[PDB]
Ligand binder design. Structure first.
Ligand SMILES: *[C@@H]1O[C@H](CO)[C@@H](O[C@@H]2O[C@H](CO)[C@@H](O)[C@H](O)[C@H]2NC(C)=O)[C@H](O)[C@H]1NC(C)=O
Ligand SMILES: *[C@@H]1O[C@H](CO)[C@@H](O[C@@H]2O[C@H](CO)[C@@H](O)[C@H](O)[C@H]2NC(C)=O)[C@H](O)[C@H]1NC(C)=O
Ligand code: NAG
Ligand code: NAG
Ligand code: MIG
Length: 863
C-alpha cells in the first residue's frame, strides 16, 4: 500500500494496535509524519446487493454492510444510493438509510429533482459493487474526478464518512477557516466545520460559518470540477497527499453534488446555479463603510463622522455597533448617551450617507409591569423562541443584555415577529441596512443557564476537532428544539435562517428595495441574502496577508461582498500597517474599517488631516469609486450568471501554472490586477505578472513585464494596480458619496491587447430597486474596439437614467496616435472631439465628447 493513500481508521484518539485490531484495520507505524498508523483494510465496508435499478432520474442501488460491530454508535446496515443526472454538468447522489428517514437540510433554495436524466452529459458515472465505490469521470478525456474507492463508506447514526481521490493538488475552498494560503497543498490536514464564535487566527479552527464546497483545477487546460456536500451536522474535512479528501460528519445523510466546467469560473457558476446566486447589492453598499465597537456616545460617533467628511473621504456608510442600544438590548437606543440619535440619522441622510445598525439574535427575558420590554413580550406571545429538549420551555442563555431567549428563525411566524420589531424600531431610527452579529448562535454560557444534559446529542460518540472539543461550547444545547429540528442537526443553519428572516423583514421595512444585510454566520447559499465580513481579526501583518484567501474563498461560495475589518479589529493599529491595509482595503468587495472596543482610533482621518495615511486612503478610495461602474457590473454578472467578483489569478490564467498558488494578489473580474505591499517595512512586493499585456492604472503606460515574477516598486503611498489589455473599463467621475457620484459624467478606459482590440460592458439600473434584473428594468451595453473603431452597442435598454448621463472621456492605452476622430450616432455623423496624445506612454485621451448612456455610437479614427 502507498502510505499517501492510507485512510485513517483511528480519527478519535492516539493510534494503538489494540484499538486497530479491534476495529479490523491495518497496522503499520513505520510511516512518515502524520501518515496514519492505523488505516482501513481493502475490504471493510459496504457492497452492492443485487442489481442497480434504472430510474427516470438515473439509478438506485441497495448497499449492504459486511457485519462489523458498534464503534461510533448504531451502524446502518442497509443503505440506499440514489443518483440523479440533474443537468449535463451537475451530478447528484445521496446515501440514505433504506429503512429510516433521517435529517436532511431544508435548504430554502435547493429543490428536489423531478423528471428525467439530462441529455449530453459531460461526465460518466461508474459503480463498483465488491466493495462499493462510486466514480465520476470526465467524458472528453476520461479524467477520474470523483473516486471513493480509496476508502470505505462508513454510515453510522452519528458517524458518516466518504473519501474521494482527486486528479490534482490545485484544490480551493472549504470554510469558514483562516487557511493562510489559497491553494490547499494537500499535505495531511483536518479542517473542522461547525459554526463558532472564535478568533480567525493562525490556529486553523472552525470559525463562524460552514462551507463544504471545494473547486479543483484538473490541469492547465482549465478543465475544473467542484464537490458540494449538503450536510449541516458538525464535520471535518481531511486532506492528504494521495491526493484525496475525506468528509466525516456526525449526522444527517451524505448528499453530494459534483459539478463539471471548462474553466474554474464555470464550476463556480454551476455551483451557484444549484445553491443560489448572490443578491445584487445596493450600489451604495459598494462604497466605503466606517465602523467601531464602542464610540460610547453619539457625540463621539458624530465627531468621527465629521472629521472623515471634513477630510473629503469617500464614505457612504456609517455602522452603529451595540453601544447605540439601551444597555445592549435590541430595538432600543440609549436616550442619554445616544440622545438625539434620530437627528443624527437625518444628518447622515442629508449628507448622502447611510446608517447600518447591528442587531443580535438574543432577546433579553427581563420584562416587568414596571419596565416592559416589547421585543420579549411580543415574541413570548407569538411563542417563537428556541425551546429546551422538553419542546415547550424557551431555552435560556446569556449574552450582552443578561439572560436571554433566542428567536427560532426557522419558524415562518418568527419572521413575522422579527419584521414587526424592525418596523417599530425603524419609526424611531431610520436605519438603511442591518448588521446581524453573533448568529452562530453565540452564547456566553455553555448550552444554557442550566448547562446541558449528558446524552448522545450533547456528548456524541465522535466529536470532530472543533475548538474546545464539545459541541455546546459557547452556543445552544444540542438537544434544543426548533421548527426545522434539533440543534444538533441545524446548528450550522442558524445564521442562514436568520439572514432569510431578515431579508423577509426588509420586504416590509424597505418596500421594493435591496437595502443591505451583513451577516457573520453563513451556510451554503447565504450570499443570496447577505454580505459577510471575516470577523474579529487583529491588527498584525499576518492578518493582512490572511485576508486575501478569505475574500477569494467567499467569492467561490457565492458571497462576493466580503471583506475583513480593515486595519484590524483587535489591538491598536500601527500607522504603517493601517496605511497598507487601507490601500488594499479600497479594493475589497466589502470595504469597511471596523475597530474593537477600547483600542486607539483607526478611522482614516484620525491619523491627521494631512497625514500620508489619510492622503493615500482618499486617493485609493477615489479610484475605487471611479471604478464603481465596473465593480457594479461584476456584481451584476455574479448575480445573473454566477461569476466571481474578487477573482484569483488562476481563474483567468490557469494555462500558466505559476498562478496556481498566487494568493498575495487578486483580480477584480477579468481585467484589474491588484498587487498590495503586505510586508512590514517593505517598499516593494515580489509579484507575479501573468501572461497578458498590462498597463499601470495611474499613468497608463505599458509595463515591460509579462508572464514572470517581478519586484514591483511600491513606495509608502502606492499599491499596484494594472489593467489587462483586451478590456474596456467603464468609469464615473468620483465624489464622496455614491448618491452624488452616480450623477457624474462617465468615462471609458480602453486597454488594447496585442491586436489593438478590447471588449467590455456596462450594466446600469437605478442602483436600489429589488428585482430590476428579474423584471428587466436595466441598461446593458457592450463596448468593442477593433482597431480604428469603438462600437457602443446596446443590448438591453429598459432603464433610462433621468440624470442625463454620458461618456465624456475615452482613454485609450497602448495605441499609436489616433487622428481625425469621428463620432457617429446610429450611423449618422456626428461635433469633432479633442484628442490629446502622449507619444512616449502611447496613451490617447478623447475629450469634448458626449456619448449619451443607452445610445449606440461608433467612434472611428485613423493612424
Ligand atoms: C416552543 O414552545 C411553545 C410553547 O411554549 C410552542 O408553542 C406552540 O405554538 C403553536 C403554534 O403557534 C400553538 O398552536 C401551540 O398551542 C403552542 N403550544 C403551547 C404548549 O403553548 C412551540 O411550538 C415550541 N416550539 C418548538 C420549536 O417546539
Ligand atoms: C459632489 O457632491 C456634492 C454634494 O455633496 C456637490 O457639492 C455640490 O454640487 C453643486 C455644484 O454643482 C452645489 O450646488 C452644491 O451646493 C454642492 N455642495 C454642497 C455642499 O451641497 C458637488 O458638486 C459634487 N461634485 C462632483 C465632483 O461631482
Ligand atoms: C492560538 O490560540 C492561542 C489561544 O488559544 C493564542 O494565544 C495563539 O496566538 C494562537 N496561535 C496562532 C498561531 O495564532
Ligand atoms: C431586570 O431588570 C431590572 C430593571 O432594571 C433590574 O433591576 C433587575 O436586576 C434585572 N433582573 C436580572 C435578572 O438581572
Ligand atoms: O462579542 C462581541 C460582539 N461583536 C462581535 C463582532 O464580530 C464585532 O464586529 C462587533 O464589533 C462586536 C460587538 O457587537
Amino acid at each position: 500500500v502507498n502510505e499517501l493513500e492510507r485512510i485513517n481508521c483511528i480519527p478519535d484518539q492516539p493510534p494503538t494496535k489494540a484499538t486497530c485490531d479491534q476495529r479490523g484495520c491495518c497496522w503499520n507505524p513505520q510511516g512518515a509524519v502524520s501518515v496514519p498508523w492505523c488505516y482501513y483494510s481493502k475490504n471493510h465496508s459496504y457492497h452492492v446487493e443485487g442489481n442497480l435499478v434504472n430510474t427516470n432520474a438515473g439509478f438506485t442501488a441497495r448497499l449492504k454492510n459486511l457485519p462489523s460491530s458498534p464503534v461510533f454508535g448504531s451502524n446502518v446496515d442497509n443503505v440506499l444510493l440514489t443518483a440523479e443526472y440533474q443537468t449535463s454538468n451537475r451530478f447528484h447522489f445521496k446515501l440514505t438509510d433504506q429503512t429510516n428517514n433521517r435529517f436532511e437540510v431544508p435548504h430554502e433554495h435547493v429543490q428536489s429533482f423531478s423528471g428525467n436524466a439530462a441529455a449530453s452529459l459531460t461526465y460518466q458515472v461508474e459503480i463498483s459493487r465488491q466493495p462499493f465505490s462510486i466514480k465520476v469521470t470526465r467524458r472528453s478525456n476520461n479524467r477520474v474526478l470523483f473516486d471513493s474507492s480509496i476508502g470505505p463508506l462508513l454510515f453510522a447514526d452519528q458517524f458518516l464518512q466518504l473519501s474521494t481521490r482527486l486528479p490534482s493538488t490545485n484544490v480551493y475552498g472549504l470554510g469558514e477557516h483562516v487557511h493562510q494560503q489559497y491553494r490547499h497543498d494537500m499535505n495531511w490536514k483536518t479542517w473542522p466545520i461547525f459554526n463558532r464564535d472564535t478568533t480567525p487566527n493562525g490556529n486553523g479552527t472552525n470559525l463562524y460559518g460552514a462551507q463544504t464546497f471545494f473547486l479543483c483545477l484538473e490541469d492547465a487546460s482549465g478543465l475544473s470540477f467542484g464537490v458540494f456536500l449538503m450536510n449541516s451536522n458538525a464535520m471535518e474535512v481531511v486532506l492528504q497527499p494521495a491526493p484525496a479528501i475525506t468528509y466525516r460528519t456526525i449526522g444527517g445523510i451524505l448528499d453530494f453534488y459534483v459539478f463539471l466546467g471548462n474553466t474554474p469560473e464555470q464550476v463556480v457558476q454551476e455551483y451557484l446555479e444549484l445553491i443560489g446566486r448572490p443578491a445584487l447589492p445596493s450600489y451604495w453598499a459598494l462604497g466605503f463603510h466606517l465602523s467601531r465597537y464602542e464610540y460610547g456616545t453619539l457625540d463621539n460617533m458624530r465627531e468621527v463622522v465629521e472629521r472623515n467628511r471634513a477630510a473629503q473621504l469617500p464614505y457612504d456608510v456609517q455602522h452603529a455597533d451595540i453601544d447605540y442600544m439601551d444597555e445592549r438590548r435590541d430595538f432600543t437606543y440609549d436616550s442619554v448617551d445616544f440622545k438625539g440619535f434620530p437627528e443624527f440619522v437625518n444628518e447622515l441622510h442629508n449628507n448622502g450617507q447611510k446608517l447600518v445598525i447591528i442587531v443580535d439574535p438574543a432577546i433579553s427575558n427581563n420584562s416587568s409591569s414596571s419596565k416592559p420590554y416589547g421585543p420579549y413580550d411580543r415574541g413570548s406571545d407569538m411563542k417563537i423562541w428556541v425551546n429546551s429538549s422538553d419542546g415547550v420551555t424557551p431555552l435560556i442563555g446569556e449574552v450582552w443584555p443578561g439572560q436571554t431567549v433566542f428567536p427560532d428563525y426557522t419558524n415562518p411566524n418568527c419572521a413575522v415577529w422579527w419584521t414587526k420589531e424592525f418596523e417599530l424600531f425603524h419609526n424611531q431610527v431610520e436605519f438603511d441596512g442591518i448588521w446581524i452579529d453573533m448568529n452562530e448562535v453565540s452564547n456566553f454560557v455553555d448550552g444554557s443557564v442550566s448547562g446541558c444534559s449528558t446524552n448522545n446529542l450533547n456528548n456524541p460518540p465522535f466529536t470532530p476537532r472543533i475548538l474546545d472539543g464539545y459541541l455546546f461550547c459557547k452556543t445552544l444545547c444540542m438537544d434544543a428544539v426548533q421548527h426545522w429540528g434539533k440543534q444538533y442537526d441545524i446548528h450550522n443553519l442558524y445564521g442562514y435562517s436568520m439572514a432569510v428572516a431578515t431579508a423577509e423583514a426588509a420586504k416590509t421595512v424597505f418596500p421594493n428595495k435591496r437595502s443591505f444585510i451583513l451577516t457573520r454566520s453563513t451556510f451554503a447559499g447565504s450570499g443570496k441574502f447577505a454580505a459577510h465580513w471575516l470577523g474579529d481579526n487583529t491588527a498584525t501583518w499576518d492578518d493582512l496577508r490572511w485576508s486575501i484567501p478569505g475574500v477569494l474563498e467567499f467569492n467561490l461560495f457565492g458571497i462576493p461582498m466580503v471583506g475583513p475589518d480593515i486595519c484590524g479589529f483587535a489591538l491598536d493599529t500601527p500607522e504603517e500597517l493601517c496605511r497598507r491595509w487601507m490601500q488594499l482595503g479600497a479594493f475589497y468587495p466589502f470595504s469597511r474599517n471596523h475597530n474593537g472596543q477600547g483600542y486607539k482610533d483607526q478611522d482614516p482621518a484620525s491619523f491627521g488631516a494631512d497625514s500620508l495615511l489619510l492622503n493615500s486612503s482618499r486617493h485609493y478610495l477615489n479610484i475605487r469609486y471611479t471604478l464603481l461602474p465596473y465593480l457594479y457590473t461584476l456584481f451584476f454578472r455574479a448575480h445573473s450568471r454566477g461569476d466571481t467578483v474578487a477573482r484569483p489569478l488562476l481563474h483567468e490564467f490557469y494555462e500558466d501554472n505559476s498562478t496556481w498558488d498566487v494568493h498575495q494578489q487578486f483580480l477584480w473580474g477579468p481585467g484589474l490586477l491588484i498587487t498590495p505591499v503586505l510586508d512590514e517595512g517593505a517598499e516593494k512586493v515580489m509579484a507575479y505578472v501573468p501572461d497578458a499585456v498590462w498597463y499601470d492604472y495611474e499613468t497608463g503606460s505599458q509595463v515591460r513585464w509579462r508572464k514572470q515574477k517581478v519586484e514591483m516598486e511600491l513606495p509608502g503611498d502606492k499599491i499596484g494596480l494594472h489593467l489587462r489589455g483586451g478590456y474596456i473599463f467603464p468609469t464615473q467621475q468620483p465624489n464622496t458619496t455614491t448618491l452624488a457620484s452616480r450623477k457624474n459624467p462617465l468615462g471609458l478606459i480602453i486597454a488594447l491587447d496585442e491586436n489593438k482590440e478590447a471588449k467590455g460592458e456596462l450594466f446600469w439600473d437605478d442602483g436600489e430597486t429589488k428585482d430590476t434584473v428579474a423584471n428587466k428594468v436595466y441598461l446593458l451595453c457592450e463596448f468593442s474596439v477593433t482597431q480604428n473603431r469603438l462600437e457602443v452597442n446596446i443590448s438591453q435598454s429598459t432603464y433610462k437614467d433621468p440624470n442625463n448621463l454620458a461618456f465624456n472621456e475615452i482613454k485609450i492605452l497602448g495605441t499609436e496616435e489616433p487622428s481625425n476622430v469621428t463620432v457617429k450616432h446610429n450611423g449618422v455623423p456626428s461635433t469633432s472631439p479633442t484628442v490629446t496624445y502622449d507619444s512616449n506612454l502611447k496613451v490617447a485621451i478623447i475629450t469634448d465628447i458626449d456619448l449619451l448612456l443607452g445610445e449606440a455610437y461608433t467612434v472611428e479614427w485613423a493612424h
